Coordinates of C-alpha atoms and ligand atoms in Angstrom, one line a residue:
Chain A
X1 CA 86.3 24.5 -4.7
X2 CA 84.4 26.1 -7.5
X3 CA 80.4 26.2 -7.9
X4 CA 79.0 23.7 -10.4
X5 CA 77.2 25.3 -13.2
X6 CA 73.6 23.8 -14.0
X7 CA 72.1 23.4 -17.5
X8 CA 70.1 26.1 -19.2
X9 CA 67.7 26.3 -22.2
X10 CA 69.6 23.5 -24.2
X11 CA 72.6 22.5 -22.7
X12 CA 72.4 19.1 -21.0
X13 CA 74.5 16.5 -19.2
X14 CA 75.6 13.4 -20.6
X15 CA 78.1 10.5 -19.8
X16 CA 81.2 9.6 -22.0
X17 CA 80.9 6.2 -23.0
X18 CA 83.9 6.0 -25.5
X19 CA 86.4 8.6 -26.5
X20 CA 87.2 8.5 -30.1
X21 CA 90.3 10.1 -31.4
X22 CA 90.9 13.5 -33.2
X23 CA 89.0 15.4 -30.4
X24 CA 85.9 13.2 -31.1
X25 CA 84.0 11.3 -28.3
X26 CA 80.9 9.2 -28.1
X27 CA 78.4 10.5 -25.3
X28 CA 75.1 9.1 -23.9
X29 CA 72.9 12.0 -23.2
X30 CA 70.3 11.3 -20.6
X31 CA 67.6 11.3 -22.8
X32 CA 68.2 8.0 -24.5
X33 CA 70.5 9.7 -27.0
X34 CA 74.0 7.9 -27.8
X35 CA 75.2 11.3 -29.5
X36 CA 78.5 12.2 -30.9
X37 CA 80.3 14.7 -28.8
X38 CA 82.9 17.2 -30.0
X39 CA 85.8 18.4 -27.7
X40 CA 85.6 22.3 -27.8
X41 CA 86.8 25.8 -27.0
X42 CA 88.3 26.1 -23.4
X43 CA 88.6 22.4 -23.6
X44 CA 91.1 21.4 -26.2
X45 CA 94.2 20.9 -24.0
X46 CA 93.4 22.6 -20.9
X47 CA 91.3 20.4 -19.1
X48 CA 91.9 16.4 -19.6
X49 CA 88.9 13.9 -19.7
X50 CA 88.4 10.1 -19.8
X51 CA 86.1 7.1 -20.4
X52 CA 83.4 7.4 -17.8
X53 CA 83.1 10.8 -17.1
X54 CA 80.2 13.0 -16.4
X55 CA 80.0 16.1 -19.1
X56 CA 77.9 18.8 -20.0
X57 CA 77.1 19.5 -23.5
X58 CA 75.2 22.0 -25.7
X59 CA 73.0 20.8 -28.5
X60 CA 72.9 22.3 -32.3
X61 CA 69.3 22.9 -33.1
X62 CA 70.2 22.6 -36.7
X63 CA 71.8 19.1 -36.3
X64 CA 70.9 16.8 -33.5
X65 CA 73.6 14.0 -34.6
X66 CA 76.7 15.7 -33.4
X67 CA 76.6 18.2 -30.3
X68 CA 79.4 20.3 -28.6
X69 CA 80.8 19.4 -25.1
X70 CA 81.5 22.5 -22.8
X71 CA 82.3 21.8 -19.4
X72 CA 83.4 18.6 -17.2
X73 CA 82.7 17.7 -13.7
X74 CA 85.4 16.4 -11.1
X75 CA 83.8 13.3 -9.8
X76 CA 83.0 15.2 -6.8
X77 CA 80.3 17.8 -8.2
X78 CA 79.1 14.9 -10.0
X79 CA 78.2 13.5 -6.7
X80 CA 76.4 16.7 -6.1
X81 CA 74.3 16.4 -9.3
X82 CA 73.7 12.6 -8.4
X83 CA 72.3 13.7 -4.7
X84 CA 70.2 16.9 -6.3
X85 CA 69.2 14.3 -8.9
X86 CA 68.5 16.1 -12.1
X87 CA 70.3 13.4 -14.1
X88 CA 68.6 9.8 -13.9
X89 CA 69.7 7.7 -10.9
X90 CA 69.4 4.3 -12.8
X91 CA 73.1 4.3 -13.3
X92 CA 76.0 3.6 -11.1
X93 CA 79.3 5.4 -11.9
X94 CA 81.8 4.8 -9.0
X95 CA 85.6 4.3 -8.5
Chain B
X1 CA 93.4 32.8 -6.2
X2 CA 90.1 33.4 -4.3
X3 CA 86.3 32.1 -5.1
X4 CA 83.9 33.7 -3.3
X5 CA 80.0 33.7 -3.6
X6 CA 77.5 35.9 -2.9
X7 CA 76.7 36.3 1.0
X8 CA 73.6 34.9 2.1
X9 CA 72.1 36.5 5.5
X10 CA 70.1 34.7 7.8
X11 CA 68.7 37.8 9.2
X12 CA 65.8 40.1 7.8
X13 CA 67.1 43.4 8.3
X14 CA 68.2 45.9 11.2
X15 CA 66.9 49.5 9.9
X16 CA 68.4 52.8 10.9
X17 CA 66.6 54.2 13.8
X18 CA 64.9 57.3 12.4
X19 CA 64.7 60.3 14.8
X20 CA 61.2 60.8 16.2
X21 CA 60.2 64.3 14.7
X22 CA 57.7 66.5 16.4
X23 CA 55.8 69.4 15.0
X24 CA 55.0 72.1 17.3
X25 CA 57.1 70.3 19.8
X26 CA 58.3 73.0 21.6
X27 CA 54.9 74.6 22.9
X28 CA 53.8 71.4 24.1
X29 CA 56.7 72.2 26.8
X30 CA 55.3 75.6 28.0
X31 CA 51.6 76.9 28.9
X32 CA 50.5 80.5 28.6
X33 CA 48.7 81.7 31.5
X34 CA 46.4 84.1 29.7
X35 CA 48.4 86.7 28.1
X36 CA 50.7 87.2 30.8
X37 CA 52.7 84.7 33.1
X38 CA 53.7 81.4 31.8
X39 CA 54.6 78.2 33.1
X40 CA 56.5 75.0 32.0
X41 CA 54.6 71.6 31.8
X42 CA 58.0 69.8 32.3
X43 CA 60.4 69.8 35.2
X44 CA 63.7 71.9 35.2
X45 CA 67.1 69.9 35.5
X46 CA 69.1 71.2 38.3
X47 CA 72.7 70.1 37.0
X48 CA 72.4 71.9 33.7
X49 CA 70.5 74.8 35.0
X50 CA 67.3 76.7 34.2
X51 CA 65.4 75.8 31.1
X52 CA 66.4 72.3 30.3
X53 CA 63.1 70.1 30.7
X54 CA 63.2 66.7 32.3
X55 CA 62.0 63.4 30.7
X56 CA 59.0 61.6 32.0
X57 CA 58.7 58.2 30.6
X58 CA 57.4 56.0 33.8
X59 CA 58.1 56.5 37.7
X60 CA 61.2 58.7 37.0
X61 CA 62.5 61.9 35.4
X62 CA 65.1 61.8 32.9
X63 CA 67.4 64.5 31.9
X64 CA 68.8 65.0 28.1
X65 CA 72.0 67.1 28.4
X66 CA 73.4 65.5 31.6
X67 CA 71.2 62.6 30.5
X68 CA 73.6 60.0 31.8
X69 CA 73.7 61.2 35.3
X70 CA 70.2 62.1 36.0
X71 CA 67.6 59.7 36.2
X72 CA 65.5 59.9 39.6
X73 CA 62.2 58.1 40.4
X74 CA 59.1 60.0 40.8
Chain C
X1 CA 65.2 101.1 10.8
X2 CA 66.1 98.2 8.8
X3 CA 70.0 98.9 8.7
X4 CA 70.4 98.2 12.8
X5 CA 68.6 94.7 12.2
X6 CA 70.9 93.6 9.6
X7 CA 73.8 94.8 11.5
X8 CA 73.2 93.1 14.6
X9 CA 72.1 90.0 12.7
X10 CA 75.6 90.1 10.9
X11 CA 77.2 90.9 14.5
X12 CA 75.7 87.8 16.1
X13 CA 76.0 85.6 13.1
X14 CA 79.8 86.2 13.2
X15 CA 80.1 85.4 17.0
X16 CA 77.2 82.8 17.0
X17 CA 74.3 85.0 18.6
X18 CA 71.5 84.0 16.7
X19 CA 69.1 81.5 18.2
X20 CA 67.8 80.4 14.7
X21 CA 64.6 78.7 15.6
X22 CA 62.2 78.9 18.5
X23 CA 63.2 76.0 20.9
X24 CA 66.9 77.5 21.0
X25 CA 65.1 81.0 21.6
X26 CA 63.0 79.8 24.4
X27 CA 66.0 78.3 25.7
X28 CA 67.9 81.3 25.6
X29 CA 65.0 83.4 26.8
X30 CA 64.5 81.3 29.9
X31 CA 68.3 81.2 30.9
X32 CA 70.0 84.9 30.8
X33 CA 71.2 84.8 27.3
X34 CA 68.5 86.1 24.8
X35 CA 69.4 90.1 24.4
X36 CA 66.9 90.6 21.7
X37 CA 63.9 88.9 19.7
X38 CA 62.5 89.3 16.3
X39 CA 59.6 87.4 15.4
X40 CA 56.7 87.8 12.7
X41 CA 53.1 88.1 13.4
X42 CA 52.2 86.1 10.0
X43 CA 52.3 82.7 11.8
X44 CA 49.6 80.4 11.9
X45 CA 47.6 79.7 14.6
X46 CA 49.5 82.5 16.6
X47 CA 50.4 80.7 19.6
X48 CA 54.2 80.5 19.0
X49 CA 54.2 84.3 18.9
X50 CA 52.1 84.6 22.4
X51 CA 54.4 81.9 24.1
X52 CA 57.4 84.1 22.8
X53 CA 56.0 87.2 24.4
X54 CA 55.4 85.2 27.4
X55 CA 59.3 84.5 27.3
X56 CA 60.4 88.0 27.0
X57 CA 57.8 89.3 29.7
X58 CA 59.8 87.4 32.2
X59 CA 66.3 89.9 28.3
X60 CA 63.1 92.2 27.5
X61 CA 63.1 94.0 24.0
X62 CA 61.5 92.3 21.0
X63 CA 61.2 93.4 17.6
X64 CA 58.2 92.7 15.4
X65 CA 59.6 92.5 11.7
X66 CA 57.3 90.5 9.4
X67 CA 58.0 88.6 6.2
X68 CA 59.2 85.3 8.0
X69 CA 60.7 83.9 4.7
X70 CA 62.5 87.3 4.2
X71 CA 63.6 87.5 7.7
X72 CA 65.2 84.4 7.5
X73 CA 66.8 85.3 4.2
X74 CA 68.2 88.5 5.5
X75 CA 69.1 86.6 9.1
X76 CA 72.0 84.8 7.6
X77 CA 70.3 81.3 7.4
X78 CA 71.0 81.0 3.8
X79 CA 74.6 79.9 2.3
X80 CA 74.0 82.8 -0.3
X81 CA 77.1 81.7 -2.5
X82 CA 75.9 83.7 -5.5
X83 CA 74.9 87.4 -5.4
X84 CA 71.1 86.3 -5.7
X85 CA 69.3 83.8 -3.4
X86 CA 70.7 80.3 -4.3
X87 CA 68.0 78.3 -2.0
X88 CA 64.3 77.8 -2.9
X89 CA 63.0 78.4 0.6
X90 CA 64.6 79.3 3.9
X91 CA 63.2 81.3 7.0
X92 CA 62.9 81.4 10.7
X93 CA 59.9 81.9 12.7
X94 CA 61.9 83.4 15.8
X95 CA 65.4 85.1 16.0
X96 CA 66.9 85.6 19.0
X97 CA 70.1 87.7 19.5
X98 CA 72.4 86.5 22.5
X99 CA 75.7 88.1 22.2
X100 CA 76.0 91.8 20.9
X101 CA 79.2 91.6 19.3
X102 CA 80.5 94.7 17.4
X103 CA 78.4 97.8 18.4
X104 CA 77.4 100.4 16.3
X105 CA 75.9 104.1 17.3
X106 CA 72.8 104.0 15.4
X107 CA 71.8 100.1 16.4
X108 CA 71.8 101.3 19.9
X109 CA 70.0 104.4 19.4
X110 CA 67.4 102.2 18.1
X111 CA 67.6 99.5 20.9
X112 CA 67.4 102.3 23.3
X113 CA 64.4 103.7 21.5
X114 CA 62.7 100.5 21.4
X115 CA 63.1 99.8 25.0
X116 CA 61.6 103.1 25.7
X117 CA 58.8 102.3 23.5
Chain D
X1 CA 78.5 30.2 -15.9
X2 CA 81.1 29.1 -18.4
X3 CA 78.7 29.9 -21.5
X4 CA 76.0 32.3 -21.0
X5 CA 73.8 30.2 -23.6
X6 CA 73.7 27.6 -25.9
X7 CA 77.3 27.8 -27.5
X8 CA 76.8 26.7 -31.5
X9 CA 73.7 29.1 -31.8
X10 CA 74.0 30.9 -35.1
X11 CA 73.6 34.8 -35.4
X12 CA 74.5 35.3 -31.8
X13 CA 76.8 37.9 -31.7
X14 CA 74.2 40.0 -34.2
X15 CA 71.3 39.3 -32.0
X16 CA 72.8 40.6 -28.8
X17 CA 74.6 43.5 -30.2
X18 CA 73.2 47.1 -28.9
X19 CA 71.4 48.6 -31.9
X20 CA 72.9 51.9 -32.1
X21 CA 70.9 54.4 -34.3
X22 CA 72.6 56.1 -37.4
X23 CA 73.6 59.6 -36.3
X24 CA 71.7 62.3 -38.5
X25 CA 74.3 64.2 -40.6
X26 CA 74.6 67.3 -42.8
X27 CA 75.1 66.3 -46.5
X28 CA 78.2 65.1 -47.7
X29 CA 79.1 66.7 -51.3
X30 CA 79.3 64.7 -53.9
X31 CA 81.2 64.5 -57.5
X32 CA 83.7 67.4 -58.3
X33 CA 83.0 69.1 -54.9
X34 CA 84.2 66.1 -53.0
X35 CA 87.7 66.1 -55.1
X36 CA 87.9 69.7 -54.4
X37 CA 87.0 69.0 -50.7
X38 CA 89.6 66.3 -50.6
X39 CA 92.1 68.5 -52.5
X40 CA 91.6 71.5 -50.0
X41 CA 92.1 69.1 -47.0
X42 CA 95.2 67.3 -48.1
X43 CA 97.3 69.7 -50.3
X44 CA 96.5 73.6 -49.4
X45 CA 95.2 72.6 -45.8
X46 CA 98.2 70.5 -44.6
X47 CA 97.4 69.6 -41.1
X48 CA 100.0 67.3 -39.5
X49 CA 103.2 67.9 -41.8
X50 CA 105.2 65.9 -38.9
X51 CA 105.7 62.3 -39.6
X52 CA 103.2 61.4 -42.4
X53 CA 100.0 62.8 -43.5
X54 CA 98.1 60.7 -40.8
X55 CA 94.6 61.3 -42.1
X56 CA 92.2 59.8 -39.9
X57 CA 94.4 60.3 -36.8
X58 CA 93.2 58.7 -34.0
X59 CA 92.0 61.0 -30.6
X60 CA 94.5 60.0 -28.1
Ligands
MG201 MG1 88.9 19.0 -33.3
ZN202 ZN1 70.7 67.6 33.1

């Protein structure tokens, strides 16, 4: 049981649509942004993620195409996000 | 490993009971009878001996030295 | 004289004879405890000294040394770690000697003299 | 949390380092005087003959 970390001044949540190779991912950020997500530090081979996983990602203000994924939520803190509702609720992601 | 959070209290506060200091406290205990005899406004405690003054709060007198064992209704 | 006063205050400091204050002084005088009393007349509204007079009237002898702050200074209330005074302000309105402790001849002649008045 | 800000932001460590002001100094002689100072400090004022010269020995 760990506390779930919220976004702040630039970081935003997203959902993995399809995971590419070479540490690359396609992620739908909940501003209608079908962005490219880069697997990043503390995240290379320490925590594993897959298709349709809730994700948190930091933007790059000098390039909006690509963005760097920072933290992943374990399908239960995702539920907590879902009840508090900072992310759009028009999407169903269940097991 | 332990994952501890900051404690949150559903109690406003409990404050240290500050002793009620009284300036010129001693003279209120006595009374000068016009340059000579003097009397005491409070009552003397028998168990302790002469000098120790009773405490009057309401319909009883209470001691300070043997405080626990003496509380006699007025 | 000044010497016997400091001598008696030392002899009552080492053996816990000073009723350093006025409530303890009043209690000691009311009991059969206070053998000597030194109080200052430079007290505002003067009622404390009048009450003390009454305490001694009922353990009789009293002394009329001035300089309350200095009285506390040479009364031993100070920690006096250094050679000089190491505290800003400290003084006693009334000092009461209960235990006579060690006895010196000059002090006993002085107390007999002050008893004679 | 995991990261205190936007991770990919440029000039981050530079921005948040504590600005510590230069310490004022006596003038360091320059030119021939500096070479004389170095010569005195190394070959006539031998300090730590043990081991190596150990110029700039860390204090520990
Ligand atoms: Mg890579
Ligand atoms: Zn009592």
